[PDB]
Amino acid sequence: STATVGRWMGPAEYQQMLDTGTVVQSSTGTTHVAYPADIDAFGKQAKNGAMYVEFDVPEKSLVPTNEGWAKIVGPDSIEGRLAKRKGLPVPEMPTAENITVRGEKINGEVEAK
Ligand SMILES: [Zn+2]
Ligand SMILES: [Zn+2]
Ligand SMILES: [Zn+2]
Ligand SMILES: [Zn+2]
Ligand SMILES: [Zn+2]
Numbered sequence: 001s002t003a004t005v006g007r008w009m010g011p012a013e014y015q016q017m018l019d020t021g022t023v024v025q026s027s028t029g030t031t032h033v034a035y036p037a038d039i040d041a042f043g044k045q046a047k048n049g050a051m052y053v054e055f056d057v058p059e060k061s062l063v064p065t066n067e068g069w070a071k072i073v074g075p076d077s078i079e080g081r082l083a084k085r086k087g088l089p090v091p092e093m094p095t096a097e098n099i100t101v102r103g104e105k106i107n108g109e110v111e112a113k
Contacts (some may be wrong), residue, residue: 001059005070006037008019008046009053014101023057023093027076035070041105042069043110050109052103061094069104 009017013024023031034041037054044054062070063079073079073091080091103112 002056002097003011003035003059003062004037004054004056005033005035006039006052006054007031007033007051008042008105010050014051014053017055017096018099021095021097023072023096025074025076025093029074029080031072031074032074033070039050039110039112043105046105048105048107050105051101053099054102055099056097057094
């Protein structure tokens with residue numbers, strides 16, 4: 001079972017994700033996403049030159065946040081490091097399918113599709 005999510009990212013993340021077919025582990029090891037996907041969810045916080053990209057991941061890979069967004073946890077995140085110490089399985093970056101560019105942020109303004 002899969003869920004469509006949305007994320008604002010740099011082109012380098014976009015390309016790596018496309019090439020590997022897998023979600024890229026972020027600089028903190030934690031990848032925040034808009035669920036359900038919405039360009040407007042984090043469009044304000046997004047940096048100029050960023051791309052809004054929607055993609056499909058297994059629903060099971062989405063970790064509960066008690067907030068209006070979802071997150072994907074990687075092996076080197078603090079959550080992953082805690083999991084290993086507790087003898088839990090190492091979190092793994094899930095597959096990402098139907099990767100589609102749905103927006104861009106140019107000169108402080110958000111454009112859809
Ligand atoms: Zn978070
Ligand atoms: Zn809008
Ligand atoms: Zn909050
Ligand atoms: Zn334009
Ligand atoms: Zn444009």
